[PDB]
Structure 1
Amino acid sequence: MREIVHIQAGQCGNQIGAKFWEVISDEHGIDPTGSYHGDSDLQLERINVYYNEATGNKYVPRAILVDLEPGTMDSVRSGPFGQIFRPDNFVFGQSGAGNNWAKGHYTEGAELVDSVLDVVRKESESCDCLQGFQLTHSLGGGTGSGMGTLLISKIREEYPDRIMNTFSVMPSPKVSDTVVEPYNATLSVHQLVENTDETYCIDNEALYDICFRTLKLTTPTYGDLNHLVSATMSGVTTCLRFPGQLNADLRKLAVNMVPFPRLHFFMPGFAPLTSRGSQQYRALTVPELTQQMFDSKNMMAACDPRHGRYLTVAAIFRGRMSMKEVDEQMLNVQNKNSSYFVEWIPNNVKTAVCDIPPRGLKMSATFIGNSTAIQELFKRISEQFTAMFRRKAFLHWYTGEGMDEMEFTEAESNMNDLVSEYQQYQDATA
């Protein structure tokens, strides 16, 4: 009965957050009304991790919905699984954040954050043994980015001994809403490096390229992007939601994945890559899963793993398959490409198997890699940042909210430090 409190902040945060709850509610046999109608006890054995029980055996997501405008949250309440959410956990303002980190972190969001922390507290008090928190948000906007990291800092103050986890969507000009996204992202990363234990880096650059090149979607929507996110999120939380030996809770995952405190930005991967309604008929063989899950084309962060080294890896296979063949294939990857795994962390690849597959598939595999190649992501954001900041472009939006140019300089420097720290261990030898 180790509970996780979920928070979703902003448009992006609530969009994927909603899809996340749709997917796993279906995996746990919970319907839009909160009633269980599954055919396996494995579905309810660890249901308490993400759900609260009410009278009539109703299952209520331990989820808090946050935004500075009511737009997306009204869409969620009118969505398929809208009713399932605890109505009082809908915490929203009216002013919006205007894609402005400063508005979310210092002014507009500061006004709303206490209200959110009240709901968090009411949830946490009900917990038998709170593991920690998972946050879904984008880093390119204002609310999810600015207020999201504000929440994280406050939550760490009240719950300093609990694990902080995030699903952070990284901005990309291929799907850009605004030109100030590199600013918001750089300021957010600065917060994440300090105040999170585990961050899944979900790059919109990657999600777009996957949708276009692989899934052959000529005009990718956010729905096409979130089909990939929800599928990844379900996968990385499998070990948390079902019985298992490996990475069964947030802390044990952190201990396995995070050799150094600042280097906790994970590169997720998923196989097989599918589009919505594709409904493919041939299951993949265990060898096929293993080759694809490690393939660059299946990474949700636009980084080439062959350009860096793996510090740690977590692989999760779902569905009825040969655990013997899985072990063999996993051992085969490491032994065939041993150069890409740091030799000074022995046996840094851990594998889990879950009998229950995701809907629409007989076989699937989820990848979680702590690679030094993730620096490519932060480099990219840093280049976009400096291109504008060298001319102090668009800063007036931020100085108008009380921010000083120094705070940008500090944020940039810390991210450039993160990049250099990754490069340090990419060259390190035993």
Structure 2
Amino acid sequence: MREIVHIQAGQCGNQIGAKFWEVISDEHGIDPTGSYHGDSDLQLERINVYYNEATGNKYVPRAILVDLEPGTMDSVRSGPFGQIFRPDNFVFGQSGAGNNWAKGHYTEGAELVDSVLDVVRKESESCDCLQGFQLTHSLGGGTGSGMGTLLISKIREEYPDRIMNTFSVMPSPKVSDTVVEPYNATLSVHQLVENTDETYCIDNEALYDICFRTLKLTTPTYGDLNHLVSATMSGVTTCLRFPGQLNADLRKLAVNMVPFPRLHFFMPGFAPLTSRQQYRALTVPELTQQMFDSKNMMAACDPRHGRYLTVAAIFRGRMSMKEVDEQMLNVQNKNSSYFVEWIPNNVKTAVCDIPPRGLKMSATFIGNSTAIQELFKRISEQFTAMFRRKAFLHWYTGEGMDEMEFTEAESNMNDLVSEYQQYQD
């Protein structure tokens, strides 16, 4: 009984979190009404990690939905699995955050944060042994970015010895809502560097490129992008949701993936990614090749530009575990120049017999690569292009912020980049 408390904040955070609970609910045999109808005991072996058990053998996700406007969460409540969430776990305001990190972190968000923590506390008080928390959010908006990192700071204050984990969607000008997204992402990255133990970097550009070039989607939508994020979230959490010995909990995963506390930003990867030749069987060599291919990663960073500090790989489905080891060792031995040599045996492989829905087998990739600095470099460059002219700052100074706070967040993200560069050589 190692419970995880889930939190989803803002438009992006709630839309992706909704699909996540939809995908894993199907994998665990939970229907939209929280009733279990699976056929395998592996489905319920670790069901309490993400689900609470109510009267009548009902399973209720341990999820808290937060937003500063009602719209998106109204859609979730009307969505497919909307009825499965605890009604009291909907916490929302009416003002909105106007894609403004300051509104979510300092003004509008501050007015609502205490009520969110009341629900978090309630969910924690019922946990036999709470592992930690996982937050889904974007960094380019106001609520998920600004109030999301505010929640993290206060959750850390009240639960300082629990693990804080995030799925963070990074903005990209190719899939942009407002020009201030680099401002909001730089302010958030500052928070994440200090207050999270593990952060999966999901770049909206990578998701777009995959939908367009690989999946052959002419006009990708936010829905299409969220399918990739759903599948990736389900893959990286397999080790927590099913019986296993590798990275089986949040703290052990951090111990194996984070050699230095600030360098906890991961590149996730998923295979297969097939366009609609979708029925063809996928061999273990193919799964391994694609899973390590840059085109199958979702941070928009070329791994061959840096080195892997650590790697976690999860193979799902009924397959030759002997052939999995061989192919994993083949990838390391055929490209050992992209793995740091001062961390012996830094590639760990886990297997799970239950494959995702509609797939004979798949592989999920988790990399702590120094190439992630390219993602923070893009943000920093977009940040500086506007900040050198102080463009659009009035949205933030109007909420009480000072320019110095922008300079500090910028410097810290540039330090992070430099820190990655030193371990790449």
Do they fold alike, i.e. is TM over 0.5? yes
- Partner secondary structure for residue 289 of structure 1: helix
Q: Match for residue 389 of structure 1?
A: 387
- Partner secondary structure for residue 166 of structure 1: strand
1:166-203 deviations in whole A, cap 9, x for unaligned? 00000001100000000000000000000000000000
1:280-326 deviations in whole A, cap 9, x for unaligned? 21121000000000000000100000000000000000000000000
CA–CA separation in structure 2 for the residues paired with 1:301 and 1:202: 5
Preserved CA contact (<8 Å) 2:214 2:275: no
Shift of 1:126: 0.1
Preserved CA contact (<8 Å) 1:149 1:192: yes
Preserved CA contact (<8 Å) 2:216 2:275: no
Preserved CA contact (<8 Å) 1:227 1:275: no
Q: 1:341 to 1:363 in 2, by over 3 A?
A: same
Asked if 1:95 is matched to 2:95, the reply is yes
1:93-141 deviations in whole A, cap 9, x for unaligned? 0000000000000000000000000000000000000000000000000
Q: 1:150 to 1:171 in 2, by over 3 A?
A: same
Shift of 1:55: 1.0
CA–CA separation in structure 1 for the residues paired with 2:73 and 2:281: 37
1:196-226 deviations in whole A, cap 9, x for unaligned? 0000000001000000110111100011100
Preserved CA contact (<8 Å) 2:163 2:196: yes
CA–CA separation in structure 1 for the residues paired with 2:274 and 2:74: 29
Q: 1:274 to 1:222 in 2, by over 3 A?
A: farther
CA–CA separation in structure 2 for the residues paired with 1:301 and 1:272: 17
CA–CA separation in structure 2 for the residues paired with 1:329 and 1:30: 34
1:328-377 deviations in whole A, cap 9, x for unaligned? 00000000000100000000000000000000100100000000000000
- Partner secondary structure for residue 314 of structure 1: strand
CA–CA separation in structure 2 for the residues paired with 1:293 and 1:123: 36
Q: Match for residue 420 of structure 1?
A: 418
CA–CA separation in structure 2 for the residues paired with 1:280 and 1:61: 32
Preserved CA contact (<8 Å) 1:239 1:249: yes
Shift of 1:275: 5.6
- Partner secondary structure for residue 111 of structure 1: helix
CA–CA separation in structure 2 for the residues paired with 1:274 and 1:26: 21
CA–CA separation in structure 2 for the residues paired with 1:275 and 1:240: 29
Question: Any gaps of 5 or more consecutive residues in structure 2?
Answer: none
Preserved CA contact (<8 Å) 1:140 1:185: yes
Matched residues, percent identical? 100
Q: 1:275 to 1:96 in 2, by over 3 A?
A: farther
Preserved CA contact (<8 Å) 1:224 1:275: no
Preserved CA contact (<8 Å) 1:51 1:59: yes
